[PDB]
């Protein structure tokens, strides 16, 4: 459903999704266009900077994309879009209902293979224009000639011909006369990849059992065969700087390098990408260069470089192994928690189910960096426990950042899944901190908070006990015991004077903080799942179990609004930075905006994925949502920062 | 030469001078349009001078057995289960949850034994209670727990008979003139053995006992014996159900330790041998399926303060046989001493010499050997000392070489005061003086 407050801006934190990317070459530089769901992203291969993002989201997922000099050809559901600088220049509708799923571009021809084994040829109108635009003919690979088309390529110096790689065969079409020139002999196992060699009229085929064939497309024979047992081959690339190496890419995430001249195996990069997300999905040498760009389905794009040889006379036999060079990446699993790091809306902290805490930049995607989990030394000098085989921390339930004393000491306080202590982090250093706050009642951490002096962190355990630690020195200061069931929300005043806790027994406790008294206790009518404290207006909102949002102020301890309308469990909510609205999101696939002055629902968005996190910026710039599927962070901009919206209630 | 000709390139006719890239592949300044096969050859030579022709394409197309097998393989060692016996010098041992972590011990854990069949671990110490833990990986819980008042326990053993394998007794004893026997029934019926049937002067403390199997040798009827180490040189063997004193075996010197070996004879008949060591180093072997008479008397080569003998490689008292046909002869015999020296004898040849030489004398840990236990397969020996911290080694054998990667400097072994091997899982339990059983799993099993 279209909205009237927030309009979609971008989905940040995404680098790849395991569509095989395309490389392109403007002049002597290289760009790398990778698909992220329904948009592509162009990267500058010398530094992996994000040059361009495609202007509109395609109506379905981009499934095959190529790149000549200035133009990028992206094939999604039925049609091929021709894009320059992100902005779409042309759209080629195919005459079928079959999904286009391969394409090549050579000459005046764009050739797009669908999944019903038909091939659509498109021609330029006059050979001076920029992209193939008019329909020319249709080719068909029937079941007699070959299997399913597994690749579609044009190996060089072949005057208007096309190498079609089917699952068992290699056909060669003349795309002007519409003819089938040559059909090879069969192959005893199903071939998955193809790459044209820089040797003349040689293609390289990669099978579903472990072998690379070097087919000579003019003799009709195979030149040589390379066997990699029990490995499905997903990429093939060739080195073109006077060193005849081949790089094969294996769907258990391996990148194997071969010398073709002296028939040895140079090196293997093991676990270069995750097998569970597809292995190495596209690996290609930037040509003339000893650097190879890999990309996998785990939302990661890397570069590896070959240093020059260490022997000053031999060289060709002492090949130094490939080392790592720059890389970009994001979360490999959908994020589980979201926060904004500062009031400027520049960085945002983001934790995922793949057990990593990233810090993503809303201004420039090169500044996105993974917060490191390299632990400090123990304070006394004793040994730290844990496994020797280091793994990442359990996935993050909650976090609370308060950069009042930033750079001074620990700054982020975070709570993990089914473990009884809350770690700290430093956002300035972008690393873990020295302290892990215990709950001291053998209960898991259900909530965290920290004061805006930056001195105090608050832990709320599942046995109902708030413990207040000092963020500088890491020791227990106080411990309140009011609740008996799990404490799901803690917050404190902007003047460190009254704190407010809410547990899932449905009591909101109001404590004085300087004196350790309680000021009161208010029993609601459902267990409370989440609190958000708007700190300037002193109004906090509770997501109750009866699917209402109770807005209650902390000064006079009354329920002052009660917002009804959600049909399932409220996953998240957040206040406007001016504290006028509250945006919630719930498991009925909806996001609502409530004007708590008038107490009604301003806007509603039906979004197909359920939004698990909603956060406003600390200025009124952006909304950041986080959904069930999708490894990134969806970013919306409120149009009411530029116009004024009517606080008049919607329905249906 | 070529496997196809398409008959379209010959009648095509290209221009040349329209674009700057094709403007270079002319051979004259008057050429403007050329034939298709000529044009294909021009840009074939141009492709060949952009990317120069390598040697792997025209060099070769597809006693070399080793080179071929190396060019196909990627791993070069035995894979997972086609090993069946341990690799030396590098263990494979993960750490599980500490077994008594569920219910803490109030004393140093003095003895420790697994069940022969069930997943049960019995711990016990000087706080005069004994605890049984259902062990697994994650959650080692406490089955039951029995606190004998006024009776600190020092040795506790699961006994399970060979006839019906349905008794499941626990024999436990400390520095007392009695020994308790709990009959496992899942109230608790325990009995007390407190009568040496005329032999109370030579047995003033029931601390060092061991439980074993004995055959009648006129019927094929087995029964358990407990064996008590007494003052002078005496071992008092008595029935494990009736408590009747059966026989006694006296060695000459200060009796320090003893172990039980079994050897099969025929179908359904075996023979029990008691192996008892002087402090000085001389070893007696008593046949006790007949009257307790000496059959062999030999001497440990070296060794002057002898604390602990153990056998292994077959059925010991800590790897017990559940069925009488599964009784095996022990291969190895380790005699561990006060200096930390452990002689190791191979009884496949060292039952004949009467001054037999050890296959190796280990010297890796330097203080008094207080535990040494063989893994049930008989491929690891575990030396352990309760005198300094972290004094435990697992020596691989037959190679007689200590594993060098475990334990490390960060293994929380503690002051190792007991150790036990699982009969089936390949699993160490190590109890220290703080009251903690730590638990490890050997991934070879």
């Amino acid at each position: 459903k279209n909205s009237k407050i927030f309009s979609p801006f971008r989905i940040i934190g995404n680098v790849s999704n395991g569509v095989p990317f395309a490389t392109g070459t403007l002049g002597s530089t290289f760009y790398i266009v990778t698909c992220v769901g329904k948009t592509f992203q162009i990267y500058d291969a010398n530094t992996l900077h994000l040059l361009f993002v495609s202007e509109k989201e395609t109506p379905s997922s981009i499934v095959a994309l190529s790149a000549h000099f200035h133009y990028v050809y992206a094939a999604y559901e039925n049609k091929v879009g021709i894009y320059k600088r992100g902005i779409e220049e042309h759209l080629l509708e195919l005459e079928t209902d079959a999904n286009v799923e391969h394409l090549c571009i050579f000459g005046d021809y764009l050739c797009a293979s669908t999944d019903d084994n038909s091939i659509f040829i498109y021609k330029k109108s006059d050979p001076q224009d920029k992209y193939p635009s008019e329909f020319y003919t249709k080719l068909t690979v029937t079941e007699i000639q070959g299997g399913e088309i597994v690749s579609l390529q044009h190996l060089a110096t072949y005057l208007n011909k096309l190498t079609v790689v089917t699952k068992s065969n290699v056909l060669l079409f003349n795309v002007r006369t519409g003819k089938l020139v040559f059909t090879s002999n069969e192959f005893p196992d199903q071939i998955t990849t193809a790459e044209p060699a820089p040797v003349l009229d040689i293609i390289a085929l990669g099978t579903v059992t472990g072998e690379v064939i070097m087919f000579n497309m003019r003799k009709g024979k195979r030149i040589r065969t390379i066997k990699i047992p029990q490995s499905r081959i997903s990429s093939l690339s060739f080195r073109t700087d006077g060193s005849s190496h081949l790089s094969v890419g294996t769907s258990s995430g391996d990148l194997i390098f071969y010398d073709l001249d002296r028939r040895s195996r140079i090196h293997v990069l093991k676990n270069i990408h995750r097998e569970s997300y597809g292995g190495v999905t596209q690996a290609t040498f930037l040509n003339g260069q000893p650097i190879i760009v890999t990309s996998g389905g785990d939302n990661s794009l890397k570069e590896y470089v070959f240093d020059p040889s260490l022997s000053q006379g031999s060289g060709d036999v002492v090949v130094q192994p490939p080392r790592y060079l720059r890389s970009r990446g994001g979360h490999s699993q959908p994020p589980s928690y979201i926060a904004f790091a500062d009031s400027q809306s520049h960085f945002m902290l983001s934790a995922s189910k793949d057990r990593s805490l990233w810090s993503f930049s809303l201004r420039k995607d090169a500044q996105s960096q993974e917060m490191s989990q390299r632990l400090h030394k123990k304070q006394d000098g004793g040994r730290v426990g844990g496994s020797t085989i280091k793994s990442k921390f359990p996935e993050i339930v909650a976090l609370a950042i308060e950069n009042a004393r930033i750079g001074e000491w620990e700054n982020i306080i975070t709570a993990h899944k089914d473990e009884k202590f809350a770690r700290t982090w430093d956002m300035r250093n972008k690393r873990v901190g020295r302290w892990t706050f215990d709950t001291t009642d053998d209960g898991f951490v259900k909530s965290v908070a920290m004061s805006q002096c930056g001195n105090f962190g608050f832990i709320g355990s599942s046995n109902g006990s708030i413990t207040i630690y000092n963020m500088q020195s890491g020791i227990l200061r106080k411990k309140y015991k009011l609740h008996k069931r799990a404490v799901t929300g803690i917050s404190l005043d902007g003047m460190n004077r009254k704190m407010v806790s809410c547990g899932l027994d449905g009591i909101v406790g109001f404590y004085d903080f300087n004196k350790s008294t309680l000021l009161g206790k208010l029993k609601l009518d459902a267990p409370i799942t989440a609190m958000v404290y708007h700190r300037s207006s002193d109004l906090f909102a509770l997501a109750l179990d009866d699917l209402s949002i109770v807005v209650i102020d902390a000064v006079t301890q009354r329920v002052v609004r009660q917002l009804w309308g959600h049909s399932n469990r409220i996953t998240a909510f957040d206040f406007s930075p001016e504290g006028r609205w509250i945006v919630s999101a719930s498991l009925d696939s909806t996001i609502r905006t409530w004007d708590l002055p008038t107490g009604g629902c301003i806007d509603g968005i039906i979004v197909d994925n359920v939004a698990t996190n909603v956060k406003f910026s600390p200025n009124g710039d952006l909304l950041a949502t986080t959904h069930v599927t999708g490894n990134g962070i969806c970013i919306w901009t409120n149009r009411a920062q530029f116009k004024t919206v009517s606080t008049r209630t919607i329905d249906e | 030469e070529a496997a196809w000709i398409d008959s379209d390139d010959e009648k095509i006719k290209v221009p040349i001078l329209v674009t700057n890239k094709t403007k270079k592949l002319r051979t004259s300044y008057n050429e403007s349009k050329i034939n298709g096969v000529h044009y294909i050859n021009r840009l074939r030579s141009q492709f060949e001078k952009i990317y120069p022709r390598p040697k792997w394409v025209d060099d070769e197309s597809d006693i070399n057995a080793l080179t071929k097998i190396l060019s196909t393989t990627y791993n070069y060692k035995d894979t997972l289960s086609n090993s069946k016996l341990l690799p030396p010098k590098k263990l494979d041992i993960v750490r599980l949850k500490d077994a008594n972590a569920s219910h803490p011990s109030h004393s140093a854990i003095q003895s420790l034994s697994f069940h022969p069949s069930k997943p049960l671990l019995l711990t016990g110490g000087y706080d005069k209670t004994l605890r049984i833990y259902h062990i697994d990986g994650k959650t080692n819980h406490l089955v039951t727990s029995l606190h004998l008042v006024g009776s600190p326990i020092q040795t506790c053993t699961f006994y399970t008979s060979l006839s019906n394998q349905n008794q499941q007794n626990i024999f436990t004893a400390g520095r007392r003139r009695y020994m308790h026997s709990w009959d496992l029934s899942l109230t608790a019926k325990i009995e007390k053995f407190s009568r040496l049937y005329g032999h109370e002067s030579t047995q003033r403390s029931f601390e060092n006992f061991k439980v074993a199997h004995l055959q009648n040798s006129q019927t094929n009827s087995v029964h358990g014996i407990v064996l008590l180490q007494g003052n002078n040189g005496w071992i008092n063997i008595l029935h494990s159900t009736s408590g009747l004193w059966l026989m006694g075996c006296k060695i000459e010197g200060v009796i320090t330790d003893f172990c039980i070996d079994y050897q099969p004879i025929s179908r359904g008949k075996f023979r029990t041998i008691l192996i008892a060591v002087n402090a000085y180093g001389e070893v007696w072997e008593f046949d006790l399926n007949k009257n307790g008479h000496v059959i062999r008397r030999w001497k440990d080569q070296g060794g002057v303060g002898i604390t602990k003998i153990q056998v292994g490689g077959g059925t010991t008292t800590t790897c017990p046989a559940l069925q009488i046909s599964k009784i095996k002869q022990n291969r190895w015999l380790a005699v561990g001493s006060e200096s930390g020296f452990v002689n190791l004898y191979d009884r496949n040849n060292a039952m004949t010499s009467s001054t037999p030489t050890p296959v190796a004398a280990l010297d890796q840990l330097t203080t008094t050997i207080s535990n040494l236990q063989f893994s049930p397969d008989g491929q690891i020996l575990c030396m352990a000392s309760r005198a300094v911290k972290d004094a435990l080694r697992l020596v691989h054998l037959p190679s007689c070489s200590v594993f060098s990667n475990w334990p490390t400097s960060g293994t929380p072994l503690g002051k190792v005061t007991s150790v036990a091997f699982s009969p089936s899982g390949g699993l160490l339990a190590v109890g220290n003086e703080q009251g903690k059983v730590r638990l490890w799993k050997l991934n070879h099993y």
Partner: peptide, 28 residues
Amino acid sequence: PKVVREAKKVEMTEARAYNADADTAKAA
């Protein structure tokens, strides 16, 4: 002293590439 496995600073170079736009011809 062991051998020095230090990495050089890598800069890209100017490479020539065959473009396939000359691999398409029209008939009269």
